[PDB]
């Protein structure tokens, strides 16, 4: 519902009672029309429909004028992937998503494909822009259809764009003067958009100061904090939801039940196959479909929860176990039907060892929920089945004692092969 606000906050849009409200203390009027989907996780969806809009009327009844030259805008956003057959429109058609104009002066936020654009228009109408563009040729993108944090700061000399707390862009704007900023704010997709186009946003805020990088980084962490884990897209991780599994230490690797052994072999993700020169990605919807079950008033997965990691093997739900007696530093996990046996552990404690914001989680096998003894962490290990030839190997879905010490190190090793993320089907990702 916000992060850090040291008297510089002048607009603070937050969810309240199936509505959005300005909690800044300036009492702006907010009108959410019917085409806007809201939820109590403070996310709102702008669509292509005419009634999908928000009008914020800022408070003109106050004597105090809060913004002169210095001001900042912050929000989280989730931008759906290009449609593979619609790359040309994606690349060329720019659309406004937030517009604040009064007397041919103000600001706007717009999107053109994989680019998000901040535009300033001073009181004379003179215009400057700054943008952040993310790669659409990554095997695995940090940005495409995943929640990320934008902060835009403005002073006399510079317009800056921070992404997830880090400075990414900077435009000199000495040649424009101040912008008249008290106008209506219209959240609405405006441009030559596909009928299918949409955008999700969250925690929209305006500040009457230029936020320091220090401040933005703090706000990033505070607004990232949750007691629950997240999936790959950054939404709350859920029980009873079908998920593909991603490994942050092995981005292009996915798990498949071996055809003649009750173990999970690791294979390489297939990639974009249709020869457009503008795009590349690795496929996400592959490997076994996993599902998380509660071991036991909502379906949200929280840190330190005890779980069963299951997956679907044709039309049966199977389970991931560890054989109780393994002497080696790591061992292949046992994938089999749901079953009780005193020769196998089946209880996993889901973990979050990283102290910085992340969508990765870790999976800890323990004897019993009760015991303090730690068996190992689920991760990928390598097996040289011929000679030790570094380029000829077989990777496997394993439990590992080695990761137990490795997760202790600070700062957290983001790239450990015991870092997992869960990917549900999402309408913002087609392949």
């Amino acid at each position, epitope marked *: 519902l916000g992060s850090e606000i040291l008297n510089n906050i002048i607009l603070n849009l937050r969810y309240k009672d199936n509505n959005l409200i300005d909690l800044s203390g300036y009492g702006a009027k907010v009108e959410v029309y019917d085409g806007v989907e809201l939820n109590d996780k403070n996310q709102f969806k702008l669509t292509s429909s005419a009634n999908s809009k928000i009008r914020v009327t800022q408070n003109q009844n106050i004597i105090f004028n809060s913004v002169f030259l210095d001001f900042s805008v912050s929000f989280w956003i989730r931008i759906p992937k290009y449609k593979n057959d619609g790359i040309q429109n994606y690349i060329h058609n720019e659309y406004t998503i937030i517009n604040c104009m009064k007397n041919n002066s103000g600001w706007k936020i717009s999107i053109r494909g994989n680019r998000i654009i901040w535009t300033l228009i001073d009181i004379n109408g003179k215009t400057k822009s700054v943008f952040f563009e993310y790669n659409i040729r990554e095997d695995i993108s940090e940005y495409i259809n995943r929640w990320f944090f934008v902060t835009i700061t403005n002073n006399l000399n510079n317009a800056k764009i921070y992404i997830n707390g880090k400075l990414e862009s900077n435009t000199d704007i000495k040649d424009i003067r101040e912008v008249i900023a008290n106008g209506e704010i219209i959240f609405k997709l405006d441009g030559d958009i596909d009928r299918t186009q949409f955008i999700w946003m969250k925690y929209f805020s305006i500040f009457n100061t230029e936020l320091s990088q220090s401040n933005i980084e703090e706000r990033y962490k505070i607004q990232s904090y949750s007691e629950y884990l997240k999936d790959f897209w950054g939404n709350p991780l859920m029980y009873n939801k079908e998920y593909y599994m991603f490994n942050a*230490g*092995n981005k292009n690797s996915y798990i498949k039940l071996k055809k003649d052994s009750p173990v999970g072999e690791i294979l390489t993700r297939s990639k974009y196959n249709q020869n457009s020169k503008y795009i590349n990605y690795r496929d996400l919807y592959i490997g076994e479909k996993f599902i998380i079950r509660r071991k036991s008033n909502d379906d949200i997965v929280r840190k330190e929860d005890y779980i069963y990691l299951d997956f679907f093997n044709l039309n049966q739900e199977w389970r991931v176990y560890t054989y109780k007696y393994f002497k080696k*530093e*790591e061992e292949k996990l046992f994938l089999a039907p749901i079953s009780d046996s005193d020769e196998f552990y089946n209880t996993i404690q889901i973990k979050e060892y990283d102290e910085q914001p992340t969508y990765s989680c870790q999976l800890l096998f323990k004897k019993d929920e009760e015991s303090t003894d730690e068996i190992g962490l689920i*991760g*990928i*290990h*390598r097996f040289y089945e011929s*000679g*030790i*030839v*570094f*380029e000829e*190997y077989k990777d496997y879905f394993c439990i*590992s004692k*080695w990761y137990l010490k*490795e997760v202790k*190190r600070k*700062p957290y*090793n983001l*790239k*450990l*092969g015991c870092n997992w993320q869960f990917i549900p089907k999402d309408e913002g990702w087609t392949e």
Partner: nanobody
Framework: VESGGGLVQAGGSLRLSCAAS??????????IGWVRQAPGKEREGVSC????????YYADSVKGRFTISRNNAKNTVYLQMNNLKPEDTAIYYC??????????????????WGQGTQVTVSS
């Protein structure tokens, strides 16, 4: 940047070094490894060492002949190659990768590469 390469009679010795303060400016935890490529062949991982605890790994093809080490203070990495054979002839690259698992990175998993140093073994 690698150095130390050159022409060596069989089976003599050679010590490669790499200033690996580059290749590692992005990584808090990493493997530094040596990958070589012979003129008609695919890249061949030969050895690596972890920034973590100095664990070392070797390909069977160089076992008992190669030793990898690290100065730490100068952040320099060394490869001692003993009893070289003509099969060892190649360009040798020093590379760095994230510390993902308890095993040496495959050649495609290395993220930052030096320019390589030529090593030739004759007879």
């Amino acid at each position: 940047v690698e150095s130390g390469g050159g022409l060596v009679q069989a089976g003599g010795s050679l010590r490669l070094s790499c200033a690996a303060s580059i290749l590692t400016y992005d990584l808090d935890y990493y493997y530094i490894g040596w990958v070589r490529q012979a003129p008609g062949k695919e890249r061949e991982g030969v050895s690596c060492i972890s920034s973590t605890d100095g664990a070392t790994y070797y390909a069977d093809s160089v076992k008992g002949r190669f030793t990898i080490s690290r100065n730490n203070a100068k952040n320099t990495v060394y490869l001692q190659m003993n009893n070289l054979k003509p099969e060892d002839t190649a360009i040798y690259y020093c590379a760095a990768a994230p510390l993902a698992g308890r095993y040496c990175p495959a050649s495609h998993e290395y993220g930052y590469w030096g320019q390589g140093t030529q090593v030739t073994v004759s007879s």
